[PDB]
Write a protein that binds this DNA or RNA. Sequence first.
DNA 1: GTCCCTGTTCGGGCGCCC
DNA 2: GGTGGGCGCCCGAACAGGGACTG
Lengths: 400, 549
Amino acid sequence: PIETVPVKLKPGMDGPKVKQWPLTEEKIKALVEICTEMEKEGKISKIGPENPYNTPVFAIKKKDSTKWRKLVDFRELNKRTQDFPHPAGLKKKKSVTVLDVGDAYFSVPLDEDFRKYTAFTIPSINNETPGIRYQYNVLPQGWKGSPAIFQSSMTKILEPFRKQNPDIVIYQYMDDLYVGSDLEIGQHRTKIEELRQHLLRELHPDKWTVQPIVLPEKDSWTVNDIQKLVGKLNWASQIYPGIKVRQLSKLLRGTKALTEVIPLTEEAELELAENREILKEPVHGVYYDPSKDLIAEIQKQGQGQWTYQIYQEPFKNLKTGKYARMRGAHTNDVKQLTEAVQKITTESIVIWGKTPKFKLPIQKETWETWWTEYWQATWIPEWEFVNTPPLVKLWYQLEK
Amino acid sequence: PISPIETVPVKLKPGMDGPKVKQWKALVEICTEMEKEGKISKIGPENPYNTPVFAIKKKDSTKWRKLVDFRELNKRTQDFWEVQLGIPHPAGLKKKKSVTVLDVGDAYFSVPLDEDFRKYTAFTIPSINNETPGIRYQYNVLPQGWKGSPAIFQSSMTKILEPFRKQNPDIVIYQYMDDLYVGSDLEIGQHRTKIEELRQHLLRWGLTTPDKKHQKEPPFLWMGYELHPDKWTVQPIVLPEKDSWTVNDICKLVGKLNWASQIYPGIKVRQLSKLLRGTKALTEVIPLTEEAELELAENREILKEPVHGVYYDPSKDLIAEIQKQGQGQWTYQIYQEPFKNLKTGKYARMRGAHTNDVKQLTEAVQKITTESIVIWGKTPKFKLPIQKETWETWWTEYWQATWIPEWEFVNTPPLVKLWYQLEKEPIVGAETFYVDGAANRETKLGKAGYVTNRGRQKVVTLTDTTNQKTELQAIYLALQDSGLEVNIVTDSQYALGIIQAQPDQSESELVNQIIEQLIKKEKVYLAWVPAHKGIGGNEQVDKLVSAGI
DNA sequence: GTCCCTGTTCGGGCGCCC
DNA sequence: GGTGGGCGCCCGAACAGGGACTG
Ligand SMILES: [Mg+2]
């Protein structure tokens, strides 16, 4: 009698068929553990091979604790389900807390003739049995469709907490609840625990920073030092058309040995000075379009030094970033990259409300072997594996 | 018998009729033995459909079989999600006090077919003696060559062995199709009499277990090997020693070899297997190549010499130890205590036009990992032909995000290395070379050349070429007209991209040479500048090579 | 737009298993 | 001759993507 809403897929499209990838004994075992409950408690059933579809699963140790979460990589089923404003002030709050609600969506029964798309498969260590398959009967976590259907009731739920507490903005993307406040941390948490006690029925946005393009400061210059300048400048061009290089690329006139010292002329030392100003200026012409893919890319500088940009149109960057991890004698590139992508996707969501598609500086096999170890979010962004021109690394680089 | 298991619903694709044709010769009659067993019933000729039929013989000639060519029905039945994800490995068996290996009898023919679908499996014998309007059955069980059978059967098997696998959370049953291996923490005669309660379970569900009941009989036979209480080995493999060779003749070989290379270390197949390169034929003979024949020689050598494998335990720990074999090839081997192999392998895959030994090492480590997760379900610890430091070098300067897991240096030559580093900084002393090449895309005529501060200038005209190529030829002039220290300035990202990446091999003759000369060099500094923007002296080279194009 | 040149997917052949 | 499904290994077809090009 709790009623169900019909849903279906983009027109002409068919449900997912994605191969499951190898899990670890501890991931399977934790997945077999919560799949047991997940069917007993009447939330999923079990299904045979007559279900042509399939979407992968792994399992995440979402804390330092011993409570595993299972997320389904619905990226593929997601981008085939017919879909449909964004709180602008959340990005500018003193701190934001992110709740995982979450176990709320099982409350509503998914539409039957759609359940067949929710199907997944649990593998066997060393293949000692065929895979055991299940299918959801109630709004699954990780699908565009759950937060949708449920908002109706989330809004009933939140109504009085949003009203009583006016200064706080609560936001809902996917399984996550982003709640924000100018409260001092400590007054914040007492509130966020007030939320949690209600729903029973740490991000600092104002601190996020942009790393602009920056020109090398030095008191003498070589041909080489200028060549690396003109070329960088020449590229910044495509971004700030208010740039200037000609009076500076005049200095490299003949065929000078890389190591010979050029002195900067009356204009040259001022052109470069005029340029280092233009780069302070805000990029003109950037307007977040909601219907276009959000494109994030990342370059690996060195010494746990990652730089990103986020854009929909080439050269029209919505945000340039620098994310700094560890400089270690036990450092993990993939782990870092994994952390980068997550942090970025989180600003991405907090600011613009949607999640970016990443252009990952990494071999696909390498990334696919490991990213599941080091993950911690209840969503998963779309990604493609690039190969970076080692040039466009110098452009966004930093200097000591 | 046919099982009491609920039946599994299968449709046809969203808009098909079902199959229908006919066939034709002394038609022989097992087809009535099935009749009285329930496995086919006879049908009334307003069932529209018919699928051809025929006879052959057994895969071990003991019976003179019957079979249907649903090759048409198969093409119209819904898609499945198959449920065999892989092939179990012996090396992943952690050994249990007691054991068995039994097989289900006539199992496809032991599970019911959805009845709303049986009609489509309607086949019809020609005639009792060459003509009368003949007989017409459907199937009531899983047919012997329909694409549904395997997936459906496997599911059913699983869904049945289930209550045994929880009524005993802890007796271990390896299930591949209709074949079983049993594992018990109990002493032989409680296992013996536990294996019964199991056989009896399957019987109750309609699966019989004849004999075929591998018993107090180590070596158990299973999955193509020869298990033992303490080791295991592959049932011997015989090499296609066919004095002349054609393609399919050689694929015969490599396949036996890759199967071979799972336990016999050292097996390598680079030269056999570039023989397929180019071909337009499947039977076309192939002249056994020199380095090939010499390589082929080597393999037959290994397999003579006998070997075993071992079992696993969560107790002791997994080790992988890679070793650089020949050209682009690698050989691994996992174990737990020193010379007792647990599994071995062979990664020879060639990914890229240009690579170096450190990325192949990375790939191999990648292949071995996911694979260990598959068999034992955990990541191993490595021991690798490369010094802890070379890695840090690589991992420092390589721009993509790379990473090998918990490893330790082994000293097994050849050792891995970077046959040269590029300079971060320009070279006081070195001629500063400005290179640039051009090429007309209509005429496919080109030009490559250089121009130094010391005022030198070559300009070789290339032909049948591409712009990218000449720009790599010019770097090539520069390196081979420069002495032991040199800076170069190229306009080409394409080129800067290849070389920064530090290739020791590539598919290209040009890059293979440009690698030669790079190793011979003492210090190089590769530097870029944007093309066509009037720079010194990228301007000067650029005209040199650009008149004519 | 056209060329290049890289990467990727896929299907075919064989291996081995039921 | 005219049988299904699975995993693996290779290789070549189809593409995808970029980066340079033409007048
Ligand atoms: Mg050029």
